Write a protein that binds this ligand. Structure first.
Ligand SMILES: [Fe+3]
Ligand SMILES: [Fe+3]
Ligand SMILES: [Fe+3]
Ligand SMILES: [Fe+3]
Ligand SMILES: [Fe+3]
Ligand SMILES: [Fe+3]
Ligand SMILES: [Fe+3]
Ligand SMILES: [Fe+3]
Ligand SMILES: [Fe+3]
Ligand SMILES: [Fe+3]
Ligand SMILES: [Fe+3]
Ligand SMILES: [Fe+3]
Ligand SMILES: [Fe+3]
Ligand SMILES: [Fe+3]
Ligand SMILES: [Fe+3]
Lengths: 172, 172, 172, 172, 172, 172
C-alpha cells in the first residue's frame, strides 16, 4: 500500500529530528546532574534537576508526536553518555544555564528556518516550545543568581539547596 | 562535607544501573518502531508503540528514583541508535515480543541476585516492576497472537491496526 | 495460524495444574463436610463449610486465569469423590485443619520452585494466594481450638455450632 | 441427637444429586474448552467459555443449597476428566450446543418427575433453573448460528472470536 | 483442653521472638536519645526521636500479633537499660543510622531464613516490615546527611534541629 | 550553649521516672499474659490483655512527654523479663487485679508527694492518669468478679473468654 510523503521539507525534518535528539541528550545530562546532587547531600537540587530532566523528555515526546502526524520518520541517533564529573552546586548550575542558552539558540534557529521556508504549520506548532523554553532559561538564570548571591561559606550550600527545594516543590 | 556511602551492594548497583540503561534503550527502540508504523499508515500500532515507549521511560525514572534514595550514583551510558528499518507489522511485533522476553529475563536476574545477596529492600522494591513487566509481556504475546490470527491478506493489516488502536485507547 | 508457546516452564506448568486440581478436590471435600453438618443439625458449620468450599473453587478459577494468560493449557484430571464418612464436628475440623496444612505446604512448594527457577512473574502472582491461604489455615486452627475448648457434653455441640455460625456470617 | 429425615423423596434426591454432578462435569468441560480457545489465539471464546463454566458451577451450588435446606445428603461422585483435544472453534461450539441440549433434557426430566410425584416444592424451586438454562441453550444456538454464518475462511476466525468477545463482555 | 501446636518452625520462632525484643531494645534507645535532645535544647530532634521510638514499639506489637495468630508463645527477655550519655546531635544520629543498618540486616536475615525454610506465610507477612524499615533507614541516612551538610558552626545546631523538627511534623 | 535546669524537684523526678519504668514493666507483663491466653485457646482474654498492654505503654509515653517538657532527663532502667508461666485464666486475672492495685497505690503515692511538695503543676497533670487508672482497676475487678461467677467447669472457660472478648471489642 502507498503511504503519503512527509509533509515537511527536508531541512525542517533534519532540524526537528536533531532537536528530538538534543532533548533526549539534555534529559540524560540533567539526570546525571541530579544524581550528583543526590549523592552529595543536595536533595533539593537533586529533585529539581530530576523533574527538569523529565520535562525535557516530555518536550522530545511532543516533537516526536508532531513528526508522526506529518508522516515524517523519526530518526533517533545514539544518545551520548552525559558528563558526570562535577565540582559543586555552583558549577552544575553554571553549566546548566549555559546549556539552556544553547537549547534556546537551537529553537530560535528552527523557528527562523520555518519563517524562511514559509512553513507556518511548524512556526505555529513551535510556539508552546518557544514559550516554555524561555520560562526554563529564565528559571535557570534565577537559580544561578540565587546560588551566587548566597555563596558557599557558613551554611551556604544548605541555604541554596533549600531554596532550590522550595522551587522544585512549587512547580510540581 | 561528608555524604553517606551508597546503601546498596556493588553488584546490585551495577545491575540496577544496567537496567536503567536497558529501559532507555527499549524506549528509543519503541519510538523507532512507532515511527515506522506511523509512516506506513499504521497509526493504531504507531499510537500503541509510542505510548509503550513512554511507559518504558517511566520505568527507567522509577529505577533512578530508587538509586537516588539509596545514595547510589546513576551511571548513564551511551544509548545506542535503535533499529529503524522494519519489514512490516508482524515482524515489528515478533521483534517486540522477543524484546519483552529479554526484559523479563533481565528483571528475573536482578530479583534472583537480590535474594542471593539478602537485599530484601531491593527485592521488595522491584515487585511493582515484576508485576508491570509481566503484564506488558503478556500484552505483546496477545497482540502478536492476534496479528498472526488475522494475517496480512485482504484487509488484514487494516483489521490488525484497528485492533491495536482499540487496545492503545483502552489503556489510556 | 501460529499461537505463542506457553510462557511458563514445564515444571511450573505441572505444579500449577496440579494445584488447580487440588483446589477443585478441596472444594468438593468441603461440600461433603458441609452436607454432613447440615444433615446432623449443625447448620452453623454447614454454612461455614459451604462458603469455604465456594472460596476454594474461587482460588482454582484465579489459578486458571493465570494459566490462560500465559498461554498454558489447563489440564483438568478426574476429581476424586470426596470422603463422606464423618464421626462428628470435632473430627471434621481436625481433618479440615490437617487438609489446610497440606494445602499450605503445596503452595510453599510452588513458591519455592518459582524462586529456584527464577520465575518471578509466578512468584509475584502467587502472593495473594500465600496470604489468603495463611488466613484460611489460621481460621481453621482457631475454630478447631474453640471446638476443643467447648467440647461435646452439656450443650457443647450447640455452642460450637453457634460460634461457627457467627464466624460464617461475619465473613460474608 | 436426632436430626429430621430428608424432606424429599428417594427418586427426587437421586435426580437432584445427579444434576449437581452433571453441572460440575459441565463446568470442567467448559474450562477445558475455554483453555483450548485461549491457547489457540481465541481469547474472546476463551473468556466466554470461562465465564460460562463459572456460571454452571453457580447452578451446582444453588442445587446444593436446596439439598441442604431439605436435610438431603449431598452425594458428590468422581468428576470425570473433560475432553481436552478439539478440532477448532466451530467443533467446540457444535459440541457445546449439543451438551446444552442434553442439560435442558436432564432438567425437563427432573421437573417432569416432580410433577408425577406431586413434589411441588421442588417443581417451584426449579423454575429459575428452567428459565436460566433455556436462556443458555438459546445463547449457544445463537453463537453457533453466528460462527456458521461467518465461516472459517479469510478473517473468519478473528471475526467470530470478536463477536463472541462482545457477548462475553456484555453479559458481565 | 488441647490447643494446637505452634504453626511456625523452631528456627523462625526464635528469630521472630529475638526481633520483638530487638524492637522493644530499639524503642528504649530512641526514648533515651530523644530525652538527651530535649534536655539539650534540641526539641526538634527530641520530637522526631520520640515519635520514632513509638513507631519501633508499633513494629514490636505487629510482630507479637503475628506470633499470637500462629499459636507461637511470645518470649519476652529482659530489656537492657539504654545508653543515656551522648556527645551531641551528630553523634546521636551517627549512632542511630548505624543502629538502623543493624535492624535492616536483622530483618534481611529473617526473610532469608523464611525463604530457606520454605515458610512463605512468614516471608509474605514480613513484606510491610521490609518496606517500612527501608523507609526508616533511608530517613536516618537523609537526616545524617543534612546534619553533616549544615554542621555545628554558628547557628548550625539550631538550623539542623529546625530541619529535623520540620520532618517530625510532616510525618505526623 | 546553656539549657535550662529541670523544672521539677529531685523527689518528683525520681517518682516519675520510676513510674515510667513501672508502666513499661506492666506492658511486658500483660503481653506475656496475653500470649499465654492466645496459646491456650483463650483469644478473648488474649486480645483484651494485648490491648491493655498497649494502653499501659501509652501511659508510659504520656509520662515521658511530661518529663521532656519539664527539661527532666528520662532515666530508663533495665526492664526485667516478665513471668511467662501461668496456671490458668482465673490465676492470670487474680494476678492482674493485684498488679493494678499496686499501680494504683504507686500513683496515689506520687500525687500525695506532689501535694506535700506544693508541686501543683504535677498534681494537675496527673489527674487524667488517676482517672484512667481507676477505670482500669475497676475493669479488672469486674472481669475477675465475672470469671469467678462463671467458674471453670462445664463450658465455663469458653463463657468467660467470650465475655472478656466482648469487653475487648467494646473498648476498641
Ligand atoms: Fe529547557
Ligand atoms: Fe527545553
Ligand atoms: Fe545563617
Ligand atoms: Fe516492558
Ligand atoms: Fe519494561
Ligand atoms: Fe485453603
Ligand atoms: Fe486454599
Ligand atoms: Fe451453658
Ligand atoms: Fe447450561
Ligand atoms: Fe446449566
Ligand atoms: Fe472483513
Ligand atoms: Fe527502624
Ligand atoms: Fe524498625
Ligand atoms: Fe493500669
Ligand atoms: Fe496504668
Amino acid at each position: 500500500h502507498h503511504s503519503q510523503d512527509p509533509m515537511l521539507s527536508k531541512d525542517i525534518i533534519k532540524l526537528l529530528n536533531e532537536q528530538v535528539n538534543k532533548e533526549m541528550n539534555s534529559s540524560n545530562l540533567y539526570m546525571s546532574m541530579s544524581s550528583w546532587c543526590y549523592t552529595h547531600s543536595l536533595d533539593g537540587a537533586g529533585l529539581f534537576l530530576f523533574d527538569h530532566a523529565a520535562e525535557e523528555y516530555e518536550h522530545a515526546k511532543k516533537l516526536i508526536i508532531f513528526l508522526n502526524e506529518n508522516n515524517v520518520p523519526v530518526q533517533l541517533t545514539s544518545i551520548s553518555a552525559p558528563e558526570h564529573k562535577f565540582e559543586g552546586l555552583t558549577q552544575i548550575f553554571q553549566k546548566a544555564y549555559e546549556h539552556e542558552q544553547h537549547i534556546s539558540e537551537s529553537i530560535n534557529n528552527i523557528v527562523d528556518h520555518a519563517i524562511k521556508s514559509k512553513d507556518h504549520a511548524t512556526f505555529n506548532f513551535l510556539q508552546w516550545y518557544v514559550a516554555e523554553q524561555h520560562e526554563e532559561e529564565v528559571l535557570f538564570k534565577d537559580i544561578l543568581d540565587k546560588i551566587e548571591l548566597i555563596g558557599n561559606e557558613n551554611h551556604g550550600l544548605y541555604l541554596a539547596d533549600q531554596y532550590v527545594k522550595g522551587i522544585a516543590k512549587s512547580r510540581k
